[model samples]
Target: HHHHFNLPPGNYKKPKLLYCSNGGHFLRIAPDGTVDGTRDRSDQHIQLQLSAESVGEVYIKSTETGQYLAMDTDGLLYGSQTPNEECLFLERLEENHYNTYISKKHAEKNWFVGLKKNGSCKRGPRTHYGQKAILFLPLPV
Candidate 1:
């Protein structure tokens, strides 16, 4: 199945795919207004931690195919390998603490910091970052 569907030319209302090719990943403001993409684990968790708060809601739909990684707010440390298949997946971790809540406000902040610290995705612009990510419900038109 072809998943590489870029938005065609049109006047985007609120439901726009605000896209960015940063850190060797193809990122876009998904229909539901959250950020999503794939990433190679060269710099790893640093990039994942930088996503907006809404990014966690969308997990990888299909089985793992291209570059992907899981992350907590601080980092992308995967859970321990458990006997069940669920153990291998990156669980959505939420922090109720006031401090943690303020850390990751939106997609752009996370994107900037992740890139600043890691200095961008080193694999050049050719690579794709659609490994695993947060997807969302479509905007009600």
Candidate 2:
């Protein structure tokens, strides 16, 4: 096992939970761009692979499925087996202590990773930042 003091500040290696503030669910993605949430907490459901050395940008990969959160050419959020330009996202920290993941590749287009009322995930425009679906809270250990 690794020691916490051995790691750098704010660079914890353990996985985190991306909890949707709107529906109170966890973000889950399928290979074909199917995003959803679940009340059933499991390693393949709420856990995520957060990289180190990222603040303005970060890569969000699923610890369970091993898929990276990617934005398609059409500004759609999907899962990618390999990391690419589309997988890089800007982590926007809101004043309310919440965060939003906006697609760096499509920043000009204002595409953000969002969750629907039905617990499914989708891409939202910059204007949707005020929406609860766009807000996320990190479940820290």
Candidate 3:
């Protein structure tokens, strides 16, 4: 059955390093279930595989801790024990050639995955589509 009924497909990309355009850091999760940014390319916990959802969104999972990236309404991030609605993110391709992850569960406020200077996570209240903190570039692993 040939099917392309306006339900566009997702990009099933390999594991990659999420590079923040603002802080110039890579998104990573440690064994302690800590999520942060790193500028060192040699960091082992930086590899995250981007998995697609049924409707063409994506989920970010860490290869190191085997955890998934989840967020709450307050804009704090979490290492989800298992895949949940809070872990889903809409992978948006920007016109500037960068990417943005809009939180799905909290789509009510339309928060995004954001990182501040020195790899700190930015709260959703302070994040928006125009901010560079929310812009990320997926690099090869």
Candidate 4:
């Protein structure tokens, strides 16, 4: 294990994201907060944006899943659909570390919503990001 006194303030050069999809690994996220392997061939930018809410300029970003992530005015990351699928949400448990979990239980109806809606693309079985279902991807901050 290594110890860091304090992280310096400076722009870091983002690394090229790599991924392998199959029976081994699947989609991969970047360290600098980018969805490395997905339906896009470009790197996404993550920043803080403040709306008419309480906290100003909260952290907001988009992943390769074609969805947006942001820290809501409640100081918690609020994940929502980008008009591509049903209802989906992502929560952040640590700094630059997040998880993609689903919760579809309301005091109302019971619909068989897509489980991995964000995991599906309109393209062929092989997405535009690559020719294979991402097995494993590693993104460096």
Candidate 5:
């Protein structure tokens, strides 16, 4: 959340899967366009590229689907065909030595990408920044 705190040293455009701490699942973009939180690691649909935008900011894109991870005003997750502020996220390295991706468009509200214990995606409106559900590890596959 600070200027000095940011993503790890890596290739910005490299595709990676967001593995959530709470659910033990990787954040995924289902073929049906729904956001999925599934523990199955072999599926590359759960992967995306964290392409850098600005300092600490990135656009999360589903590699094969050609879709961007976008959030709406209702705190709902959706897919976008192109980039926008809604598809932007501020990637930060957190205190637990993990990562947290908060919407750059909704930065003031702290709209974190989160998941529940049973591999359920959490709505952005109530997603807690400090919760285990919001913590993630970006694994490059």
Candidate 6:
């Protein structure tokens, strides 16, 4: 099914905490471009920057690393110094209030930000929708 993002065009002001449904972990981006699921919420804050007008693209910036979340062609996720085409993501809101960030570089291929049990961040296929692909509700604060 086609997903529609209804969020208005704007920089989601409040910092967000990404929770993983599978293991009850939080997603955090490191300076090395490593996205991990951590149990610590003290430092796992993200700023979602909308790239275009309303209902558009976004650049997920790491509050700790000051780097943009980027995905490589090899399906590896990391933090990037600059916001390029590869660093862009589409925020898709699911019916359950959870959201999935699809890689703009491989959106057609259905790659989503997936978290591993080891806290490793990797690209995952949409067909494999599970706790790994589901980012819990964003706590805007």
Compare the candidates by TM-score and give the number of the best one: 5
4 against 5, candidate with superior TM-score:
5
- Candidate 5 lDDT for residue 96: 45
lDDT of 2 by residue, 28-128 (tens): 76555466776556536457877743546778888778888888887677778889998997776764477777777877666778877677776445335
lDDT of 1 at 88: 23
lDDT of 3 by residue, 1-141 (tens): 111113222355579999998989999877777778999999998899988885647889998778999887578887786898889987777654778887887766768888998789887777876788988888888
lDDT of each: 0.24, 0.70, 0.80, 0.26, 0.81, 0.65
Instruction: List runs of model 2 lying over 4 Å from the truth.
Output: 1-12, 31-33, 52-54
**Candidate 5 lDDT, tens digit per residue, 1-141?**
433465665566668889887878999887666886898988868878878788788888888798898888888888788888799888888774788888888888888888889887788888865699988888877
Judging by TM-score, tell me the better candidate of 1 and 3: 3
| TM-score, cand. 6 | 0.78
What candidate 6 gets wrong by more than 4 Å, as runs, is 1-11, 44-54, 125-127, 130-132
Each prediction's TM-score against the native? 0.20, 0.80, 0.87, 0.21, 0.90, 0.78
Q: Specify the highest-lDDT model's number.
A: 5
Ordered list by lDDT, greatest first: 5, 3, 2, 6, 4, 1
Q: Which tens-of-lDDT digit does each residue in 79-102 have in candidate 6?
A: 788878888877776655677777
Candidate scoring better on lDDT of 4 and 5? 5
For each predicted model, how many residue pairs clash, with residues at least 3 apart or on different chains?
A: 8, 0, 0, 12, 0, 3
What is candidate 2's CA lDDT for residue 2?
A: 13
Give the per-residue Cα lDDT of candidate 4 at 64. 39
What would you estimate as the lDDT of candidate 4? 0.26
